[PDB]
Amino acid sequence: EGMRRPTPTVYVGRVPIGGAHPIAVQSMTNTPTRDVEATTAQVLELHRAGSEIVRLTVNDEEAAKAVPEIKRRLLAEGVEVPLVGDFHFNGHLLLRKYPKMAEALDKFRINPGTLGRGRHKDEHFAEMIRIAMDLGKPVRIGANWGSLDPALLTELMDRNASRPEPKSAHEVVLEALVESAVRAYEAALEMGLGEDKLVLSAKVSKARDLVWVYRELARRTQAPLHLGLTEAGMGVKGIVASAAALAPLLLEGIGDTIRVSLTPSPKEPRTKEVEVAQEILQALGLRAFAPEVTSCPGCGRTTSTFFQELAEEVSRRLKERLPEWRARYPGVEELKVAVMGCVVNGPGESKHAHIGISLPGAGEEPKAPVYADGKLLTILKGEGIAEEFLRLVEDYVKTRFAPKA
Amino acid sequence: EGMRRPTPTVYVGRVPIGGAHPIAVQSMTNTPTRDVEATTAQVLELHRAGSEIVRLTVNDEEAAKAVPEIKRRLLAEGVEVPLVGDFHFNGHLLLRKYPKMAEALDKFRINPGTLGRGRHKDEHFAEMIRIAMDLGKPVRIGANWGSLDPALLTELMDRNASRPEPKSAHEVVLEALVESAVRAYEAALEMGLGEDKLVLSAKVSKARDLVWVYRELARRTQAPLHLGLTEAGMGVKGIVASAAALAPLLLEGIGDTIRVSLTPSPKEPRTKEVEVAQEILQALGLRAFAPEVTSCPGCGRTTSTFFQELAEEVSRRLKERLPEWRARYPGVEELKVAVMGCVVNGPGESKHAHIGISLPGAGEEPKAPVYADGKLLTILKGEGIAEEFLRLVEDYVKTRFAPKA
Ligand SMILES: C[C@@]1(CO)OP(=O)(O)OP(=O)(O)OC[C@H]1O
Ligand SMILES: C[C@@]1(CO)OP(=O)(O)OP(=O)(O)OC[C@H]1O
Numbered sequence A, B: 001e002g003m004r005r006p007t008p009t010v011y012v013g014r015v016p017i018g019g020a021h022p023i024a025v026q027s028m029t030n031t032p033t034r035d036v037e038a039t040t041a042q043v044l045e046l047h048r049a050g051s052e053i054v055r056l057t058v059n060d061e062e063a064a065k066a067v068p069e070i071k072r073r074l075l076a077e078g079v080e081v082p083l084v085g086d087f088h089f090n091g092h093l094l095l096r097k098y099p100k101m102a103e104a105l106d107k108f109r110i111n112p113g114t115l116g117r118g119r120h121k122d123e124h125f126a127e128m129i130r131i132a133m134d135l136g137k138p139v140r141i142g143a144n145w146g147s148l149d150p151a152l153l154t155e156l157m158d159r160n161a162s163r164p165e166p167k168s169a170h171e172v173v174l175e176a177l178v179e180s181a182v183r184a185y186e187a188a189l190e191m192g193l194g195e196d197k198l199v200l201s202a203k204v205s206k207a208r209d210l211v212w213v214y215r216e217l218a219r220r221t222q223a224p225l226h227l228g229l230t231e232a233g234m235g236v237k238g239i240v241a242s243a244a245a246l247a248p249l250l251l252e253g254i255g256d257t258i259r260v261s262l263t264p265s266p267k268e269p270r271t272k273e274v275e276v277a278q279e280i281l282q283a284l285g286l287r288a289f290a291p292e293v294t295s296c297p298g299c300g301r302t303t304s305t306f307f308q309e310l311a312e313e314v315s316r317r318l319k320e321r322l323p324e325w326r327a328r329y330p331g332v333e334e335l336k337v338a339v340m341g342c343v344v345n346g347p348g349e350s351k352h353a354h355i356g357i358s359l360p361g362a363g364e365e366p367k368a369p370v371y372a373d374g375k376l377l378t379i380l381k382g383e384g385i386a387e388e389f390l391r392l393v394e395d396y397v398k399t400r401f402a403p404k405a
């Protein structure tokens, strides 16, 4: 905001993807697809966490047979989340053999590096595109440098070698990835697949490379782009790498749906990737999913236990109130609340939030000004400052986000 | 890498900051500075975690008296980490009254919005600059939009109003922040402070604004820049916002030292901010601090418990081996290890790492190829695949990062 790269709109089920539409969050299950109970449950969990589209692997016949049942069960729950089928090597076979699965999916993902080789590859690709066209389904053509077509790389390495100034092998691999996606995009369009039925991706695992790749894809094609840093890994590394890779592109207006490719720790839920995706988009002002807290790090000017506990309590309370607030108070997802440690940046940061509190740091009288809408609202003192503040936030929301219209 | 914005070199103690030098990680204590034992311990903890420079608040007389003792104790431990003193409102008084503190610090931080007002402000600023010059200390002039000089904003709001096409109030606040830093920079230089003694910052709490601000600062000044998203907040939000704000600038070559402004949860250590800072710089290929793991998210094609546990074990083992490895094997900090869930992207991603393993996913024979230096090394099978792989990684490191020269 802004400006978005303009693109045609591609509907993935009821969710529109493209330049005129909010950037969508999506995620992918990790249960065996043949396990209908486990996969249905996880799709629900991911959707409830904020995944607007959910992808599942459709890797073998047993998975393919399961898809119509999963979709049936989701619909029985009144949940219309679009499902993307992830196909590799035998997608043409499964789509051919299981038309009920083909119809149940809301989008097909093809990888131009896992279609086979030679004219087998061309025919496999054409069959899947033909099936999509016949059913009116959209397709993501998704290249990944982990599965890059070796024949194409060879072609480009030779082209490069003849150049007056040849590029490194690494630059050529990135070129080939882009070329793999662009050639398949152009082929699909030439076969009759609509511009309203084509999404592209070309993922790599390092941020700097990803920025290069998606700038090229954005320039060379008109399609909405599925953006993600592939194989981002574990823990803080996976979170940081993902945000670092996506933000430069998103700030330039590139990307129409995102997925965060975290490796879960055994103890953490699959939904973490959805939480990260939401935070990336909200950090950049591109979506508003829920209220957020701006808080200083705290330093020697404030008492650490009190301040850290206050900031945590405020974050926890906003999370708890949200289901009620969403129902009563349109627009509350945009709420910004500040919790600040001392007079140095307290009042100023608080006056930039919708409502904020500045605690007394060292050398200050034990009172805590509260600011709302850019000016002083009141001053709190004594015990229970946390609870008094949260009541003020509650009152603030009731008034600022009152419905009607 | 690249290209860095060129800047003169500013030494903060023994650490050089500037375009010719690696981007430094720093952090700030949150213990009361007057508490010598607590603050000395935390500086050590932050330095041991990777903080190359450490800042502490010097907020009152009791803090000021403590600084020489903290520095003495650090030196007794053989630890030469540079200390930055953070001054607000009374910095001129503390530096005047406690020359031993002024000498003990390796850098002074001034905030042009916490100097006072009117010609008092000018004189306070001049006194601190004069003290730095006399002691040969460098200075960070650090503006923060949480403490923006109201007189300057008023000046610019009037300038804006007279324009043919006035900007929003928000754009003007950002303009004023930049102007506050630039005017103080130019004043300091005019007083005789060397270009080798001046670092600048101008922090705001939203990523998109920060990118704007630092692009302006980079254009209008020649100083090395201390880059950070101020008041980033808690949890995943704080991590993501910080990475999203910094990466666009770092990829453009802007920024010579960084600090990540996380609010700690009560149960998490202050060192988390250092871990995040390291991951941002390493994600962008600007520093190498330690080996890292590239791993897929896992999906229905692989068994989740086995794969997630393997990837975790590998990450844990690299962390455990690092102290030994650093001593024996120069350059090992650059090691990239892949752990992949199935044949779709396993081999290709693994061939982009120094060494990687591709597990058997569904429909594959129960064996696991290992790749090193871009080609197949061997194939593992049976129980104990994790341990066999880690021995191969150990052997790989011994050979690829052998010393000598
Ligand atoms: C499932 C895979 C298969 O190509 O999907 P992509 O969209 O290429 O990338 P990502 O979302 O990182 O998931 C892992 C990949 O293996
Ligand atoms: C300590 C403060 C004081 O201005 O320092 P800055 O460098 O402005 O910003 P940050 O590093 O986010 O720390 C919090 C600020 O209050």
Ligand code: SF4
Pocket: A296, A297, A298, A299, A300, A301, A302, A340, A341, A342, A343, A344, A345, A346, A361
């Ligand atoms: S606002 Fe005050 S307490 Fe918070 S980090 Fe800044 S100086 Fe320290």
Ligand code: SF4
Pocket: B296, B297, B298, B299, B300, B301, B302, B340, B341, B342, B343, B344, B345, B346, B361
């Ligand atoms: S590499 Fe295989 S197991 Fe890992 S996410 Fe990709 S398809 Fe799934």
Ligand SMILES: [Cl-]
Pocket: A026, A027, A028, A054, A055, A259
């Ligand atoms: Cl997805």
Ligand SMILES: [Cl-]
Pocket: A030, A264, A268, A269, A270, B304
């Ligand atoms: Cl999981």
Ligand SMILES: [Cl-]
Pocket: B026, B027, B028, B054, B055, B259
């Ligand atoms: Cl710092």
Ligand SMILES: [Cl-]
Pocket: A304, B030, B264, B268, B269, B270
């Ligand atoms: Cl802490």
Ligand SMILES: [K+]
Pocket: A264, A265, A266, A267, A268, A269, A270, B308
């Ligand atoms: K898990």
Ligand SMILES: [K+]
Pocket: A308, B264, B265, B266, B267, B268, B269, B270
């Ligand atoms: K803590």
